Amino acid sequence: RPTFYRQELNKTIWEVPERYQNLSPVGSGSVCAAFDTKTGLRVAVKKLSRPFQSIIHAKRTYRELRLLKHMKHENVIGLLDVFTPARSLEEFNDVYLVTHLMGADLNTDDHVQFLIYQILRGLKYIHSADIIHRDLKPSNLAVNEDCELKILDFYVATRWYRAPEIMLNWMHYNQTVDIWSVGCIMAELLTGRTLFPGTDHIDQLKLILRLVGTPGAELLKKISSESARNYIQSLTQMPKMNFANVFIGANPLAVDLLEKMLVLDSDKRITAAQALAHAYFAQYHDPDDEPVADPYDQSFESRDLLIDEWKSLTYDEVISFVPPP
Ligand SMILES: CC(C)c1nnc2ccc(Sc3ccccc3CNC(=O)Nc3cc(C(C)(C)C)nn3-c3ccccc3)cn12
Ligand SMILES: Fc1ccc(-c2c[nH]nc2-c2ccnc(F)c2)cc1
């Protein structure tokens, strides 16, 4: 057990071990940039805000610790450390998570290729563990000075990058909701503007369909909701736009990848693994250096437990933590 010290910063209190110095607020849980004396590197420290306030929070606290302890990939946030000032379960009420500080977020063709390749390389990994991100957006992509990128989950509206099947309230969405978001991000990097800046879920849907066109009969037959159908079919029919004409000036391979990512029917969207093998990333692609994840146990997601049970499970995960070499 190391020596802890207390400090108040931006209304929040921070009790962290001696090893972490020069705590500097970065976002408000609440995140601080800091210096790690044991390793010599800059770190990001997240203090969980009200971890065990409700069952929803307690399960979220557990889910985040479990997720971060599992992620071991260059393009995904990983845990350097996890600590609590608490010396027993009884005293346990605060969680701090430590990771590498990248320094900035996401908000040249070679630049875009490298940035998207990294997002896709990290998404191939998370999708392999049967995890869906569901909120990929520029603010959730951390970038260092070497232009190295990590996916995380930390104002820019979420709905701007959300797959149309989520806006339309479909419960059965798949992993490709994240490829949609990648398409949106890649477009924004290429042109310098938000592909679909909707003001609400209705407007957002109208903006998407303006580009990709209104659903064909094959997709319309897959929509069970009379309300989702009676809305979409009640809109003035729109054809699919020519992407070469909307993304005029861009590398034709980037336009071709955009067409494969931004397909309305999610069953027809390119996966992260297929996108990695697209001609656009020929300069980066190496199937021997795009690893998959170890099996991830997410059976807990289906459980309905008490705050104290989620709390005790989180505590054990803090105790069992083994730092990387
Ligand atoms: C300040 C900004 C410039 C910056 N630069 N580098 C970093 C690194 C991290 C952060 S935020 C941070 C800091 C420490 C510990 C944890 C976090 C962020 N938490 C996080 O990414 N959570 C996360 C990742 C995923 C994945 C694995 C799905 C991506 N899911 N979750 C999550 C799960 C449940 C609830 C909340 C989040 C800022 N940095
Ligand atoms: F306006 C639309 C119509 C269909 C989609 C869509 C894309 N991929 N999957 C769906 C979908 C949506 C709702 N219910 C479903 F069953 C499948 C998205 C927007």
Side-chain angles (χ1 to χ4, degrees), residues 26-27 30-33 43-48 59-61 63-65 67-68 71 76-79 81 96-105 126 131-134 136 139-140 142-143 150-154:
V26 290
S30 309
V31 187
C32 273
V43 293
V45 182
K46 184 189 171 179
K47 177 181 182 200
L48 286 185
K59 188 174 184 177
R60 183 189 282 119
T61 294
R63 171 186 298 117
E64 181 169 27
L65 223 197
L67 275 161
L68 265 19
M71 305 291 101
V76 187
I77 184 181
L79 262 190
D81 193 18
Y96 298 78
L97 305 159
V98 182
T99 193
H100 290 111
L101 175 74
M102 300 283 112
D105 75 26
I126 97 131
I131 296 155
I132 304 176
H133 186 108
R134 296 171 233 94
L136 282 177
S139 65
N140 277 337
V143 179
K150 282 178 175 277
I151 295 166
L152 42 79
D153 191 331
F154 217 142

Side-chain angles (χ1 to χ4, degrees), residues 55 59 62 297-305 310 313:
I55 298 167
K59 188 174 184 177
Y62 180 70
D297 171 27
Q298 61 186 326
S299 62
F300 76 89
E301 286 294 8
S302 51
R303 27 213 77 102
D304 289 337
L305 309 177
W310 288 125
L313 292 162

Side-chain angles (χ1 to χ4, degrees), residues 206-223:
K206 180 205 150 278
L207 293 191
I208 291 165
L209 306 181
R210 208 175 73 192
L211 190 73
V212 304
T214 48
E218 183 193 29
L219 181 51
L220 284 173
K221 79 215 284 185
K222 287 168 197 179
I223 311 164

Side-chain angles (χ1 to χ4, degrees), residues 59-93:
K59 188 174 184 177
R60 183 189 282 119
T61 294
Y62 180 70
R63 171 186 298 117
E64 181 169 27
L65 223 197
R66 284 287 315 280
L67 275 161
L68 265 19
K69 279 183 63 171
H70 197 79
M71 305 291 101
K72 293 169 178 177
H73 187 95
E74 295 148 39
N75 308 109
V76 187
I77 184 181
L79 262 190
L80 272 54
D81 193 18
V82 56
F83 62 83
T84 184
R87 29 264 290 271
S88 76
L89 226 187
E90 298 92 275
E91 202 210 325
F92 186 54
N93 223 298

